[PDB]
Design a protein around this ligand. Structure first.
Ligand SMILES: Cc1cc2nc3c(=O)[nH]c(=O)nc-3n(C[C@H](O)[C@H](O)[C@H](O)COP(=O)(O)O)c2cc1C
Ligand SMILES: Cc1cc2nc3c(=O)[nH]c(=O)nc-3n(C[C@H](O)[C@H](O)[C@H](O)COP(=O)(O)O)c2cc1C
Ligand SMILES: Nc1nc(-c2nn(Cc3ccccc3F)c3ncccc23)ncc1C1CC1
Ligand SMILES: Nc1nc(-c2nn(Cc3ccccc3F)c3ncccc23)ncc1C1CC1
Ligand SMILES: O=c1cc(C(O)O)[nH]c(=O)[nH]1
Ligand SMILES: O=c1cc(C(O)O)[nH]c(=O)[nH]1
Ligand SMILES: [Cl-]
Ligand SMILES: [Cl-]
Ligand SMILES: [Cl-]
Ligand SMILES: [Cl-]
Lengths: 365, 365
């Protein structure tokens, strides 16, 4: 398309130059929520349909958490062409997060570093926002466009598990799936929730709250993990997920690692790294978790997806769905249609009947 | 093409199943040398032409060292569609290398582990082989199809620098470029040639021998490095390469690392790992070396290239040319035309006039 080229060559270089990343983010959210951006042209083919998590997905490409933190742009994001939308992370009480600047571009690496620190309007505000369009979402979901809600915890919380339990009770009834985010690099102590007995205790509590919701309001529960886990950590997570019957995994969050070869001036900023440098570290985590779970636990693959090949690599590694975020900050909305078009071409090329046939195909070689 | 699909879906799964990798290799070399494989269909466009190392390259996609170790299949490889051919590694005296098995497939990872150990017919045999077609090569080179020779050292050599000097004197006059391979993981002590004063002493000697050849027989000298270098190692190599006026770098050899997430049963075999798991580790090394050399030293990018996107990522990171090997063992000869066709499409897509415009483009973002 000419739009892909217009955005990538002209508009995106200009806007990102004039505005700091966080300003860009806020403007992007505003434009999306007002529906100002033109409606995506790409007609979703039947090849791209996926059935997973007790839902139909019209296409396997979603927007990752962190873009629409407060649920302000859901309808605009579906219009952008995403097959599903994940909002959040949402914390129980409102909190401002870290002081600015707290987001950084690494253009030379097609990467971003962020330390937002779970800035959130809080459960009550998001609850009311989602309630305003609850029935609209019900029809979208039935038409193959589900909604995920990513739950966080407050910085000063004295009981992580009760923060997540509050989230389940408040936003669980408005979600097709919930994400327990145990993988933010920017909240002190949080990733230690990924340890065995602690994780078991936490997810037991989350799942009990979930099971206590009425049937039509009962979401799937996923756990989102970091790319920086040890082999022991991953074995433990796999073990717990299967013991408790967690519905799926999101793989992965941003990395606190700094891979060799980063060129960006801001590469030594504190925070989670996203985008291209994360891609193959995300894909290798997907591959391991798929194998550890015997292919029986749905994975949403995320980390450095900006092409059909990126997406299909994650799918073949074991992902049933993929998300992206960082690629939008470089290529803008046209990237969504680009990834789907390329993915469809590659599936035909490699002799797959659809996305579903490609899921985990690398493990059957 | 239907051939790409035929090879990838039917033929390659079958052959690699019936034969052990080394048997496959030997058969592949035999078929190639006999010209039995059909002539590549892809018409090389002007966009793909590159001028570097004092030569025109009709396309930027070459065959990496290790496939045609003894210079037996050069003409078959040009027929396959490669823009340049690198033979070797060649050691001064013949040697058998390690005991079999010494090559292993990791199908689930699209990877290979090898510990051949510089099996070589030796300089004299290769010299005579190349002399038999010297004038044929002269015309190929003038038509944009250069020939590289990769030099190794004998296992029992007591003077590494004299081994490389012998190679320069014997095969240098038959080569468009020579590669000093200081990066094999399978010869004891070899990668320690990448240290500062040792490397300086070695390359000073190589370059003196090179400069002593007659002008029409005077090749470019490149150094091939491992992906497993420390930041100190890379700084030192960059420094030496610029001090001595080394003509270019090949980046990278196979890795002795085992990235997290390898699934192959044979992942704990000793040797160098190649293919997809090496891809982003190769690309990040290219990116660093390009920056350390201020973009003034040509790089041949190699490691896990099996697509146009893989190739263009290396080019944008700083590679003037790319090589592949491992992708052939999975997709067969059609992969060559595939990479070139996809590369050409991506260049147009991203608004590059040709390969030359894309070289190092990530560093100018
Ligand atoms: C600015 C920013 C904010 C993010 N905020 C969240 C968040 O609140 N919750 C979460 O689970 N992940 C968050 N993420 C992580 C993304 O959801 C995603 O896992 C990661 O960025 C990798 O995908 P990408 O490389 O396509 O960006 C954030 C990422 C970025 C760049
Ligand atoms: C079986 C095998 C043998 C190789 N032999 C050599 C060699 O003799 N000299 C050399 O410089 N590199 C050698 N290599 C490394 C390749 O030239 C290349 O650097 C590496 O395989 C990464 O490219 P690839 O991932 O496309 O295979 C060999 C690789 C393989 C797989
Ligand atoms: N720096 C960022 N940029 C973007 C971002 N920009 N644009 C282009 C753009 C289009 C229209 C109006 C204004 C625009 F900025 C986006 N379009 C679609 C989705 C998201 C974006 N999102 C997040 C961040 C930072 C937290 C990391
Ligand atoms: N296992 C390997 N396989 C191959 C390999 N196979 N084929 C297919 C094939 C085609 C025709 C006749 C026989 C064939 F095997 C190749 N075609 C073109 C180039 C190279 C190949 N090369 C190397 C290795 C091992 C050292 C790593
Ligand atoms: O999960 C998360 C949360 C944040 C944040 O800073 O709010 N950042 C990330 O990269 N991942
Ligand atoms: O440079 C080299 C040499 C060999 C070999 O085992 O002969 N293997 C590699 O992977 N790289
Ligand atoms: Cl009830
Ligand atoms: Cl630094
Ligand atoms: Cl003379
Ligand atoms: Cl093992």
């Amino acid at each position: 398309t000419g739009d892909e080229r217009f955005y990538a060559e002209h508009l995106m270089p200009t806007l990102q130059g004039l505005l700091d990343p966080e300003s860009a983010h806020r403007l992007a959210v505003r434009f999306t929520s007002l529906g100002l951006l033109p409606r995506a042209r790409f007609q979703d083919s039947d090849m791209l349909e996926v059935r997973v998590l007790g839902h139909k997905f019209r296409n396997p490409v979603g927007i990752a958490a962190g873009f629409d933190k407060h649920g302000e742009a859901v309808d605009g994001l579906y219009k952008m062409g995403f097959g599903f939308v994940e909002i959040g992370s949402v914390t129980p009480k409102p909190q401002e997060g870290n002081p600015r600047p707290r987001v950084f571009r690494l253009p030379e690496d097609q990467a971003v570093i962020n330390r937002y620190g779970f800035n959130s309007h809080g459960l009550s505000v998001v609850e009311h926002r989602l309630r305003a369009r609850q029935q609209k979402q019900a029809k979208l979901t039935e038409d193959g466009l589900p909604l995920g809600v990513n739950l966080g915890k407050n910085k000063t919380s004295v009981d992580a598990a009760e923060d997540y339990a509050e989230g389940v009770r408040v936003l669980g009834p408005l979600a097709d799936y919930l994400v327990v985010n145990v993988s933010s690099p920017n909240t002190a102590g949080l990733r230690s929730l990924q340890g065995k007995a602690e994780l078991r205790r936490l997810l037991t509590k989350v799942l009990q709250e979930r099971d206590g919701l009425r049937r039509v309001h009962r979401p799937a529960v996923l756990v989102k993990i970091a790319p920086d886990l040890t082999s022991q950590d991953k074995e433990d997570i796999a073990s717990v997920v299967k013991e408790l019957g967690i519905d799926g995994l999101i793989v992965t969050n941003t990395t606190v690692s700094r891979p060799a070869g980063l060129q960006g001036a801001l590469r030594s900023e504190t925070g989670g790294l996203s985008g291209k440098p994360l891609r193959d570290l995300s894909t290798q985590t997907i591959r391991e978790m798929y194998a550890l779970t015997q292919g029986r636990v749905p994975i949403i693959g995320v980390g450095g997806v900006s092409s059909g090949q990126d997406a299909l690599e994650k799918i073949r590694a074991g992902a049933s769905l993929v998300q992206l975020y960082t690629a939008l900050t470089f290529w803008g909305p046209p990237v969504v249609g680009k990834v789907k078009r390329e993915l469809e071409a590659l599936l035909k090329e490699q002799g797959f009947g659809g996305v579903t046939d490609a899921i985990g195909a690398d493990h059957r070689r």
